[PDB]
Amino acid sequence: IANQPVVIDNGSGVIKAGFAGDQIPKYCFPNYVGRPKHVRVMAGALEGDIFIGPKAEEHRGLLSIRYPMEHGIVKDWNDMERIWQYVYSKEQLQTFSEEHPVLLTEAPLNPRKNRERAAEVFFETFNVPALFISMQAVLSLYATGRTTGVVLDSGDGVTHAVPIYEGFAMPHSIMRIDIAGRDVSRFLRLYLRKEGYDFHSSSEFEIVKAIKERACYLSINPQKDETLETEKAQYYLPDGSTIEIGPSRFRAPELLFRPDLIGEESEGIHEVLVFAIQKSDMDLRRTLFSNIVLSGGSTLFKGFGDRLLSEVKKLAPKDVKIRISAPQERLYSTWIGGSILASLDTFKKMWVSKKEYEEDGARSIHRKTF
């Protein structure tokens, strides 16, 4: 049973879905379950009581949204089962889980219990013929067509940098933080309350993400932007009430570089990139500096790559060619590589079959991934 396999690119922010051997994912929607706050007195209302995908995006105001995954670690397992069921259902894929093999994704250095419980869901509740779990960095390099590359990614949950060299992922050189797009959006919300405009509800939270996506930029020199007085640019809500953002637009993404702003001493994006290259072997460093690949949504800020270059120039050894590459399709880079990996004939050997899972259990899944 070797049908056209499915590529479920997981993530706390957005969940991409579709079939193998495609250019772009057809089914992209945000990873959250929406349930109504209010009472439904009047008949002919929105049925189901559980809202996932474009219905939830359309009807935010009703729904008390709650994210099942935080930092690539599913907290609420019932909510992810409903989302994965919604992905497979007639509203998106229009196919059964029994037909196609599954390509799952996870962030590196995650809890092994979550990986086991993920496999349990796909093998038992859904009846998958074969499952395979993979990393974000390996898939990003598949999409570009390279083998050598440091993959500095920045999603909604996790930021990390896996240094791969000619098809050799070094597991001990991996640097990871739990500071990313969601924490920047949460940090922007806190600033907007200090400015004046308060947002508190979960439906109301996604307005702050939309402000962060649209009107934010990274200053090349933050001390210079502090000393100077900002212009105070405007933004229109779905309501229509105007919001003067002020200095919070440039100070919000500084959480990525200075994680001491949230009050949680970590490395930072630029330090993680340097530390990943430094932890690897001596002869591999110059090739890893030349091949720096970007991916994820929190790399899309204005002047992000310019500042990320300047920080590498400050930290790294002098007179070395730094090249921070970044494709046009950064958001779907991880899905594209999964679709390419799924289309290859070697894919049949790498996966974990249902029969192999029933015999061995979790140990066989831990062996095949690494």
Partner: peptide, 20 residues
């Protein structure tokens, strides 16, 4: 190509100049 989010005029990469 089709889909909601893209960035126009960032470029593929930012590279330092190669010396002799």
């Amino acid at each position: 190509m089709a889909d909601p989010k893209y960035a126009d005029l960032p470029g593929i990469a930012r590279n330092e100049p190669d010396v002799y």
